[PDB]
Design a protein around this ligand. Sequence first.
Ligand SMILES: OC[C@H]1O[C@H](O[C@H]2[C@H](O)[C@@H](O)[C@@H](O[C@H]3[C@H](O)[C@@H](O)[C@@H](O[C@H]4[C@H](O)[C@@H](O)[C@@H](O[C@H]5[C@H](O)[C@@H](O)[C@@H](O)O[C@@H]5CO)O[C@@H]4CO)O[C@@H]3CO)O[C@@H]2CO)[C@H](O)[C@@H](O)[C@@H]1O
Ligand SMILES: OC[C@H]1O[C@H](O[C@H]2[C@H](O)[C@@H](O)[C@@H](O[C@H]3[C@H](O)[C@@H](O)[C@@H](O)O[C@@H]3CO)O[C@@H]2CO)[C@H](O)[C@@H](O)[C@@H]1O
Ligand SMILES: OC[C@H]1O[C@H](O)[C@H](O)[C@@H](O)[C@@H]1O
Ligand SMILES: OC[C@H]1O[C@H](O)[C@H](O)[C@@H](O)[C@@H]1O
Ligand SMILES: [Ca+2]
Ligand SMILES: [Ca+2]
Ligand SMILES: [Ca+2]
Ligand code: NA
Length: 481
Amino acid sequence: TNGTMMQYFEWYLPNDGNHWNRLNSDASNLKSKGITAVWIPPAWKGASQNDVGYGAYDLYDLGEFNQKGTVRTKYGTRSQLQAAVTSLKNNGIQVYGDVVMNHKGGADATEMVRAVEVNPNNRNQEVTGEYTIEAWTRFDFPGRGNTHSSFKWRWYHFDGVDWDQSRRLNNRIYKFRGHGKAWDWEVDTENGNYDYLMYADIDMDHPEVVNELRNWGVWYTNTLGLDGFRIDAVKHIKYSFTRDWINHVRSATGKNMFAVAEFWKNDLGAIENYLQKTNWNHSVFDVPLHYNLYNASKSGGNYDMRNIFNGTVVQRHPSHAVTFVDNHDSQPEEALESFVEEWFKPLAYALTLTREQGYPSVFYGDYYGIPTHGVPAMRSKIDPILEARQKYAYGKQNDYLDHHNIIGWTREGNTAHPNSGLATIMSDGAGGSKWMFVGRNKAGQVWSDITGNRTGTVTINADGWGNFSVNGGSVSIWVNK
Ligand SMILES: OC[C@H]1O[C@H](O[C@H]2[C@H](O)[C@@H](O)[C@@H](O[C@H]3[C@H](O)[C@@H](O)[C@@H](O[C@H]4[C@H](O)[C@@H](O)[C@@H](O[C@H]5[C@H](O)[C@@H](O)[C@@H](O)O[C@@H]5CO)O[C@@H]4CO)O[C@@H]3CO)O[C@@H]2CO)[C@H](O)[C@@H](O)[C@@H]1O
Ligand SMILES: OC[C@H]1O[C@H](O[C@H]2[C@H](O)[C@@H](O)[C@@H](O[C@H]3[C@H](O)[C@@H](O)[C@@H](O)O[C@@H]3CO)O[C@@H]2CO)[C@H](O)[C@@H](O)[C@@H]1O
Ligand SMILES: OC[C@H]1O[C@H](O)[C@H](O)[C@@H](O)[C@@H]1O
Ligand SMILES: OC[C@H]1O[C@H](O)[C@H](O)[C@@H](O)[C@@H]1O
Ligand SMILES: [Ca+2]
Ligand SMILES: [Ca+2]
Ligand SMILES: [Ca+2]
Ligand code: NA
């Protein structure tokens, strides 16, 4: 009940290989703050040492083999990582490992491959005849040999690439030619077929590939003792594959692994399709909510706050929604930059942390800051919201998203939690107040703002109503503390 997930990394973390240790020694602190699950960054060897991990080179090298010019990953060695997991396990925190199965970058060598170019804006249309290119599709893993796995990757294990080493032409997408070669399906339909994204695109139609990735999922789960996954770029991956992959792993390990997929599209329709196609066997990040939050932080008070939840996954399918404010892609400078402004950030964290629907997530970047880009640590403002979730956010919810600026909602609390119950009120504009029902058994109680933004108190009247207030462009969470 009331769990809180935390993405434990940001894109511009320093390449000092001491991240696993930071996580190791921060376990006790996080669990006390209300964090119940940590989603760790790619644990495997990328195309280089300072690769964030998405340039997935070898999924069996968790900072254990000398490859790509280093033994450790950007975050550390395999032993440091496992010492980190142990620390989290001892503090009763679950561990979610990231998962990159859409592609493989940093190949060991090139191969001559027959292929055709396709239209970047419609990968279903071949724009050239068949011809030979030089693609980075060969993986032998010199530093690992056959340790853990003997599987070797070759061009026929992929559907295509975006780079021909023999000509070095820009803005090209190459679809490989051969027996049964075609972009995968089903996948997102933007650009005709969105199977191809970057690097060497893995072919989910090849049985050896499916078999291998499933086997790796199990090895990866048992090796680290993972409690779940954060699956990368699922809109570019065959939907049925991901579904059956997750099922395979849950079955082969006897664990009901939690799974949150990143279907990055600001479209609920597309996301619902993915959910239906994957038989609802796992959750998805609420990308639309993130954009609603972002757009609101950018409207200077003119966002109609009554709609903050329109078109969002948490509103339509709350059981399958992992709600977040920001991540490594939305942070400053990144490809999908859409950073929720600082002033609005705490309102955004109250919207995800104090409501009963959705599985909330805290971003490392917002919590500890992103010094390279001037983002201050906001844990001092997030901690109060975390405590409200851990101790107060329980019981029946009564919404009050009935004003273009000032919206709010209360939680009546339940006996399972001593003194539970809260009244969240926020304004993206001018301050004010709002009468809200918190429960008749609360009559006479004297409530205070756990964020400390408002210093007074609110006395619940004999009928269960309290007249709560909030400052402009701010959030207040009144509880019976
Ligand atoms: O430097 C010599 C190098 O040569 C060989 O490397 C080659 C690669 O193996 C080969 O795959 C190819 O790599 C290309 C890649 O195909 C191409 O897609 C591009 O990669 C970009 C993405 O396009 C871009 O979207 C971005 O992706 C990020 C994303 O922004 C972020 O949101 C998140 O999802 O993480 C993603 C991964 O970081 O960035 C990547 C990388 O900038 O460019 C690649 C080349 O830079 O071509 C390489 C040769 O040029 C050898 O294998 C290697 O050992 C040698 O070091
Ligand atoms: O974090 C520890 C906890 O995580 C997992 O539970 C999460 C669910 O997987 C996830 O679906 C979500 O469930 C809540 C819904 O989102 C919400 O709309 C409402 O229906 O309440 C649900 C929970 O009561 O969030 C939970 C975490 O609260 C995992 O399954 C647990 O085993 C693990 O202990
Ligand atoms: O190039 C040799 C062989 O490579 C791969 O196995 C192809 O799938 C196959 O069609 C081809 O004959
Ligand atoms: O388990 C299947 C069900 O999961 C969730 O409750 C969805 O909201 C619902 O649409 C779906 O039918
Ligand atoms: Ca294919
Ligand atoms: Ca793909
Ligand atoms: Ca407004
Ligand atoms: Na593919």
